[PDB]
Amino acid sequence: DYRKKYRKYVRSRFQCISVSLNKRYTRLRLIKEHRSPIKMELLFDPDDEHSEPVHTVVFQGAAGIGKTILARKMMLDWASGTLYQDRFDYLFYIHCREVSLVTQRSLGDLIMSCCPDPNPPIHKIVRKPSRILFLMDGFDELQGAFDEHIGPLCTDWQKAERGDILLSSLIRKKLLPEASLLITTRPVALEKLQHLLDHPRHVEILGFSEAKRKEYFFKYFSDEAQARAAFSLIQENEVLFTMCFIPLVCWIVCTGLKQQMESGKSLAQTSKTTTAVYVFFLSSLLLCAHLWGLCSLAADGIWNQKILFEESDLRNHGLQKADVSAFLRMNLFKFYSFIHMTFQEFFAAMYYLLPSRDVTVLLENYGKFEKGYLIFVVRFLFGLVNQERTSYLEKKLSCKISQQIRLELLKWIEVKAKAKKLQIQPSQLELFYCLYEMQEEDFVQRAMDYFPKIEINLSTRMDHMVSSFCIENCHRVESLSLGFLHTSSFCRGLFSVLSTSQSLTELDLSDNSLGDPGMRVLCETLQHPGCNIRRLWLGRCGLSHECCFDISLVLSSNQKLVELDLSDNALGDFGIRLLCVGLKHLLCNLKKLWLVSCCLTSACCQDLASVLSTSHSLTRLYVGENALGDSGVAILCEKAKNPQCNLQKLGLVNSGLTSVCCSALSSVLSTNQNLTHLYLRGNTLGDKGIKLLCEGLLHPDCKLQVLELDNCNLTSHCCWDLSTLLTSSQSLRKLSLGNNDLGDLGVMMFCEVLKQQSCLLQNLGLSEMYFNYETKSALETLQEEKPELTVVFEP
Amino acid sequence: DYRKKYRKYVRSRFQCISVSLNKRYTRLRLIKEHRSPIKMELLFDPDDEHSEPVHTVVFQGAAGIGKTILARKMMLDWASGTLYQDRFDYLFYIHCREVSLVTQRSLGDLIMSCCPDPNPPIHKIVRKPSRILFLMDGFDELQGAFDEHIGPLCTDWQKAERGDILLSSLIRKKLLPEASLLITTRPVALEKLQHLLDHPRHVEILGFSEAKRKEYFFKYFSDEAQARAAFSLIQENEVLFTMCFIPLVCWIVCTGLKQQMESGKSLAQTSKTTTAVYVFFLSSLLLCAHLWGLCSLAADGIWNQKILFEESDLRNHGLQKADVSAFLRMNLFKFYSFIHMTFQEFFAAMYYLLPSRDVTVLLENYGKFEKGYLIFVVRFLFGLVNQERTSYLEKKLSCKISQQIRLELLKWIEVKAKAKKLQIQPSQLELFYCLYEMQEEDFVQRAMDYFPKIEINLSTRMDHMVSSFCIENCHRVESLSLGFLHTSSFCRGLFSVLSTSQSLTELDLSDNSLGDPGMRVLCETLQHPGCNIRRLWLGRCGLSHECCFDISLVLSSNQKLVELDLSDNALGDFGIRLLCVGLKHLLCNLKKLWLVSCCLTSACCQDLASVLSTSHSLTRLYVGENALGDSGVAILCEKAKNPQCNLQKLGLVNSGLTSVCCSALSSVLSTNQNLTHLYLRGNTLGDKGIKLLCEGLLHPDCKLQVLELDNCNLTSHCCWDLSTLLTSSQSLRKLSLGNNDLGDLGVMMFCEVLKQQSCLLQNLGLSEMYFNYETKSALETLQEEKPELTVVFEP
């Protein structure tokens, strides 16, 4: 059968990368991304049979993380008899470097290119569209492929179409919808796919763990003692060991070490950044005319989208056949390419330091993946313009480089930081990569003074290290938002430089899986004498009652903390009991406290009240969305009635309240001169509860200014009472009353009351309340009648 | 309800054929045809629910086998309440004789023609397309219906289309796809219809068995004594009783006997062939002007495709209304037709002996069914041109006939036999039918001298008799291939005339269900002193160890047998033990023996070796595809090392071998001067095994010439060893090495070795081995460098 012939063909083709792929291969860390380990067998398997088409799978990875090697290993395993031997007919390796937009070819012609025979049985293949898979590797082919509106989609596979249109039709499941796809791509090209996909399954590639680094370093060196020595020399440099999570850096450093050892020379060289790694690799593998030819060749390829280089183009750039080095890898189809596109990048940067030679036009034109790649370009550029590496590079390669380009890059980063450009293109972490690449402290200080509001999302150890370096070097940061993915080991490094910073005032960690150990580390950090953090948000950090002990320690030790948030954490009654110990200290200067939806009950209300009568600083307390109950609110109000209480804003939204507690609240309104705001949204107070409250709001000593009563189940019966409030309350300024069936007569009474000049009110919230056209017209008459009084009643 | 009205209509219409159909009907033999008894209820039922339009059923039968009667009986049974009273709404009797291509009508028009009412509820019928059956009887209507490219297919049953296009749309399931079909057809019309079908279910009609012949002979004659007398008179004629498997011949002979008995005359007339039957029927039912008119009418109908004759056409051929005979059946729609199309055939032939009158133009124009029918034409013509029947026919009917037409038919068969025309039109058995029809020993002997390579398939006793007659009368047959369908009863007669032949040398019976009794009969045949068979192939004949006893008897008795093949038969160790008794006899001249996939083990290897050291004639032994093992191969080799052993070619393909036995093989290569070939494909010898073998092939006394090592699990490590062979082996000429991962360095070493003039090798098989373009180009440069050395490396 031709099936076994094709299997043997792909097994022979993908056996080596020569060196054996099976010997070379090391397992990578694969994790599912989209949330409401992973194996390939279950990867193509549907998690839910109800799910819309599973067979679309997108692999996400950095440059050199091993997407191509992963796809080739999948083909090798499938051919060798390991992956889906149950039933899955064919796998087609569409290497997007070969695919070009200008050429007009059909799917049959593409399979012809992927088949070993000049006349494979294509019709039999098409007869089984459900058993066909396409490994689309490297969606990073060129620019302008999809930035325009997609033209007509082709379903007739015999028809010849352009590369872009054919790929769009294949991806969008219009051409052979039953065919399966697996696309290895970049995050920006991931955004492009998300603009061209419908329910795909996303899988991330992380690379090598420490054990996998052991495995790779043992597999590379044929001699076990040599491998042990090389890895031992790697160990004492933490930067290299952290960077080695990417297999490409492992390969480069192993090649350098092997070549130096074959020459019998010292292996002790160390590279601070990626640029230093590449520079030492080139120096080991390295006349100036040949360097200029290579640089111009790379620049031409970058500008004109040409990755596979022909002999004519090679000749155009002043390079002879005798100039072929170990950098260019050959593929006879006669074509030359680079080992990885990052090398073409590095040589293009070297060109820009040694195609237009102005960096401004390079920076202006962005699009598709290449923008980040062009930023990746400047990344190596950022590395090369350094007071240390430039001198040694010029000495080694006998070259000359200027430094106005560094000032131009500084202007570019200034513009990028000051530019708002939210949620557009790679924004924050990549700039930190560039700054860490340069490693010039003075430039870093001059460059990060434009950042202050910093928001980053970290997923790898290298991300943690670069963020730590940048935040430590910064001196004008005020607000800092951290996101964590897939912790405490590198949190111990981040939080130290967060504490040492003398300009930070905010610290947002909401919506993370910080956990109890992470919160313990953060609290150990916050106890530092030099800490300056004044606001700390911890919403939905997955915390429990265990973190409250450490938070209480911080509150009893830290005199600068002013605001704190703990919303959506299951602290519980015991958590609040632990927290109130710190809250009652004399060194606790906390002013605002959020406890919305902390799974509290009426039991903890005895503790919080003790804080209100004792805390000399706590003014604004929000305890909404908790089953406090009428008894709990009564317990709070029993201590809140004291005129010495400093409480100003109180939040009881959706706190499961009835009218029974309202009288107690009224007492506070009669006695507390400090309570200016009070939110009661979502509580079924009722008309009797509103009357009991108005008994207190009408008191001469009441100083309330804002009151919310949304969704309080208020009918027309109470509409008179509030009217009596409006003419009499000399302090109330705002009042929200949405989500009620007050009725048209009630709003008529309100409008009749408000036309007087004796009302000091300035806002009424009647949104989500539906009224007939006469009432609406009355409200417009009122709203342009009284400009200072605002009513919201939009339909 | 109109359903019951139409049921009553068809029940009344199909009650008689007058005589009652139920009284007349006799059960026919029905069998499924396509392979990887049958009853109509399961025949419409799907064997597998996964099977694709099961509802399409095609019936295959000879002329007069009873396809029309079977369809009419099915319709009568369905109307009477016997076939699918569960649920199946309508069956429509589309008699293809009525359907014409010129007339343009719709499906509703056809149903109206098949309906008794001028305005049937057609829309209600279309509303239930899954409960509609179309019974297309006689797909052999006319010529040119489908020989051209099929035009556009019509799906709108309202639209009027031509007969050919409408039938194509209906059959191809484009017009009412949910409708079921049942087509009765001819084998050549089967070919054409299968060129218009997609997964149909084929059912073959065989006719009457001996019990069914008894039943029909009792049913026809109303008097039991008369029926017994007629059957007793018929039975003593063996040829007539064999031809009686066709119901039409039974009807003709019964009508003749009944008419002769009514006239009180003798019934002793005997007919050797079908032509004699028809001639005696004519004599019983039979002025010369009327005969010429009938003959011209039949010829005109044959040439212009007109089966239903009008009175205008009747007058056109000099036939008056007073000339209406007992043959022409009338159908008032006013139309005349023949009893069967075979009668129109016979009268067209009679015209050709008594429209163009040249037989050459008759023979040239063939197509559709009619070609065979036209051959059917000449079949009766072949009967009529005889030294015996012609004189009696001329005396009876007062006619004159010439004999140059016989010479023209002889030239036609000369051309047909000389013409290659493989797998095109009716080729071999039908010519035998014509020759048996003529019954002239001189003409048959002169005509069969150009047959020699005969390949025929037999399914009925009539086929056995005609083939036996033709083979017995032949004198220049060399090769003879027999196929059997659905045995020994007529094999006992066929094999006798096979043995008596003094020119036969080969006898191929591969892929039959010959079985042990059949092989016993064949062995009794082969022991005849006059047998001349020299090669006997018996692959996959379903043989077992029981036939080996008889084969050993033959080998000990038959001294002319030279080659014998027993591949794919479960002979087993005991079978080989029985065979080796005959193989070791002094009168056994067998030279070549095949035992591929005979379910052998290492146990039988002790016996085969005893043959090698004893058999003075066995030179080529093939025992591949058996689980012989290393021990078995060692047992063979320890006897094959003998210098006096005459073994030349040894086959061990896929014999489950390892390197352990290879050394033993090496010893044979060092000792046996006669071993010139050795096939080891599929055995995991390995590089160590290849080295052990090359220890032997490099011996000065080794005389091997061809060696195969495909799929031997050979890596690059052994590539040096074979190279040492190439420069040193002075006898090897061929070497095959496909299905290996030899590597590019290995083929480079081979090419470097081969460019020397000292290499006597002439062939290397590197197919299915995949190499890069440099290795490819080197391979061509070598192949045009050395024209005498051929390498196969096609991609």
Ligand SMILES: CC(C)(O)c1coc(S(=O)(=O)NC(=O)Nc2c3c(cc4c2CCC4)C=CC3)c1
């Ligand atoms: C900011 C974010 C999320 O890390 C990102 C955005 O875009 C990309 S990437 O797709 O450009 N790939 C890379 O940067 N790979 C890459 C990395 C390092 C070192 C090297 C490479 C390539 C060779 C040396 C160290 C971390 C990533 C990554």
Ligand SMILES: CC(C)(O)c1coc(S(=O)(=O)NC(=O)Nc2c3c(cc4c2CCC4)C=CC3)c1
């Ligand atoms: C070679 C092969 C397989 O027997 C064949 C090929 O084509 C056809 S047939 O379809 O032309 N039908 C017939 O010959 N019927 C037929 C036969 C006999 C006698 C008569 C008839 C018709 C009336 C008398 C004796 C055997 C067949 C048959």
Ligand SMILES: Nc1ncnc2c1ncn2[C@@H]1O[C@H](COP(=O)(O)OP(=O)(O)O)[C@@H](O)[C@H]1O
């Ligand atoms: N599983 C692995 N084992 C060993 N090396 C790997 C592995 N995956 C990737 N590499 C290294 O990565 C380099 C190629 O990376 P590549 O697959 O091109 O990354 P990408 O697909 O993201 O461009 C190779 O030099 C190879 O040594």
Ligand SMILES: Nc1ncnc2c1ncn2[C@@H]1O[C@H](COP(=O)(O)OP(=O)(O)O)[C@@H](O)[C@H]1O
């Ligand atoms: N089951 C049967 N019982 C009795 N006679 C039959 C039967 N089937 C066919 N015949 C005979 O065959 C003749 C018609 O054959 P027909 O059905 O037209 O063959 P085909 O359908 O192959 O043309 C009739 O004269 C009838 O006597």
